[PDB]
Amino acid sequence: HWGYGKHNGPEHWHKDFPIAKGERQSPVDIDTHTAKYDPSLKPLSVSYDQATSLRILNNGHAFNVEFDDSQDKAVLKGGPLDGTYRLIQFHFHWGSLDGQGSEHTVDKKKYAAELHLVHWNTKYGDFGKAVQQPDGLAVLGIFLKVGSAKPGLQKVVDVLDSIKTKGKSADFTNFDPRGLLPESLDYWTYPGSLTTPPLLECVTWIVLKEPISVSSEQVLKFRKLNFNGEGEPEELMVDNWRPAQPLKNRQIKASFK
Ligand SMILES: [Zn+2]
């Protein structure tokens, strides 16, 4: 099975998922000087007031905080998007040390981690149908740097001991993802892909310029999770990020001057 090791990591994925070498793969390096301000881009509309979190799952690659996406409760619209995208889950990618962990990079800078809030276009009816469409998903990416604690992250941190190993889940109701946002919704956007297999080219990426700060102690608890299942040889869940892929024939647009 694919993973993040020397034997099954990102440089191997193309053998089972040949789209790994495709024309619109993610993540990418964001060259801030080349990204063009697009005055036609709209403000993001992030409407999370009615978000209903249900569960947190260690899936062996990261942990997902899952939402009720059976109705328009938490939606993303505006920005570069046409129509309405429903929040299904969020997860993170992070490093073994603070100097790596993000998937996107900014002028080759790697952040300690990257949050992905995953949304699907309701015009396709279900997530499985949306991932088959070039405008099926919108992923909001938020960088994490290490400094001050993020108070709105601590409820996530404190449940991780209960989902240490692959295939463990826990009830995770009433979590408000608004506590993970930075102040500014200034963003970069480009067309890309899922950053894990099956690497489908179905994502409009929206990457916020302003990182959030988390504490060293918060990210250290991410790094105590396990890739392995219960009782198996312990493999710390660290460095679960795909490196930047070729930009090819794409433009990164900025919402801001
Ligand atoms: Zn992700």
Side-chain angles (χ1 to χ4, degrees), residues 2-5 7-10 12-41 43-81 83-122 124-223 225-250 252-256:
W2 66 267
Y4 294 94
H7 307 293
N8 64 358
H12 292 273
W13 292 353
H14 72 98
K15 291 176 277 172
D16 290 286
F17 305 93
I19 201 174
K21 296 185 187 290
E23 300 301 310
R24 57 171 280 186
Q25 290 290 292
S26 293
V28 298
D29 182 56
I30 301 167
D31 190 78
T32 67
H33 283 110
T34 300
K36 199 176 163 64
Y37 169 60
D38 185 351
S40 80
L41 285 171
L44 255 204
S45 173
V46 184
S47 297
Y48 290 169
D49 46 291
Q50 291 299 122
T52 300
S53 69
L54 292 174
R55 194 178 73 139
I56 191 173
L57 171 69
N58 179 335
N59 62 18
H61 43 104
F63 63 84
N64 292 347
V65 174
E66 300 167 349
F67 290 79
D68 173 16
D69 59 336
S70 74
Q71 305 183 256
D72 293 358
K73 280 186 169 191
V75 301
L76 185 64
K77 69 197 302 183
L81 303 174
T84 297
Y85 292 70
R86 274 188 198 161
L87 179 64
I88 176 175
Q89 53 105 325
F90 72 75
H91 62 272
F92 303 81
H93 306 263
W94 63 89
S96 50
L97 288 180
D98 294 353
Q100 63 187 34
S102 66
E103 296 210 303
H104 294 90
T105 58
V106 179
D107 298 333
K108 300 301 183 76
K109 177 189 175 65
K110 296 173 170 79
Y111 289 87
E114 187 173 331
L115 167 58
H116 291 162
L117 293 129
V118 182
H119 314 74
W120 58 270
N121 192 329
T122 64
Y124 299 123
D126 71 63
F127 183 82
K129 283 291 190 293
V131 296
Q132 302 179 247
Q133 302 290 343
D135 61 350
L137 274 52
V139 184
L140 180 60
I142 303 180
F143 296 119
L144 281 62
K145 66 179 190 189
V146 173
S148 300
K150 191 68 163 181
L153 183 60
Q154 190 62 32
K155 279 187 182 176
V156 172
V157 166
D158 280 334
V159 76
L160 299 182
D161 276 335
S162 74
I163 58 154
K164 182 174 181 180
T165 51
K166 175 174 52 177
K168 292 200 161 291
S169 68
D171 292 313
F172 201 67
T173 55
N174 303 105
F175 179 77
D176 186 349
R178 294 180 295 184
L180 299 178
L181 304 178
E183 176 197 325
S184 180
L185 295 179
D186 288 348
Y187 65 87
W188 297 283
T189 184
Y190 75 96
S193 76
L194 304 181
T195 70
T196 54
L199 299 172
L200 294 171
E201 293 181 334
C202 63
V203 180
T204 301
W205 276 95
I206 301 166
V207 179
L208 296 191
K209 174 164 164 301
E210 182 182 327
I212 61 166
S213 289
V214 304
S215 65
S216 61
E217 294 86 0
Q218 287 179 320
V219 70
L220 283 164
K221 290 177 179 186
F222 285 19
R223 300 182 184 133
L225 287 164
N226 284 185
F227 287 128
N228 53 280
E230 185 181 3
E232 293 170 8
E234 190 159 10
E235 305 174 84
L236 296 175
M237 185 179 280
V238 295
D239 295 316
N240 61 349
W241 52 275
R242 189 188 193 191
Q245 300 301 307
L247 188 60
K248 295 190 169 169
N249 184 43
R250 296 179 288 180
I252 305 179
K253 298 177 190 167
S255 75
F256 60 91

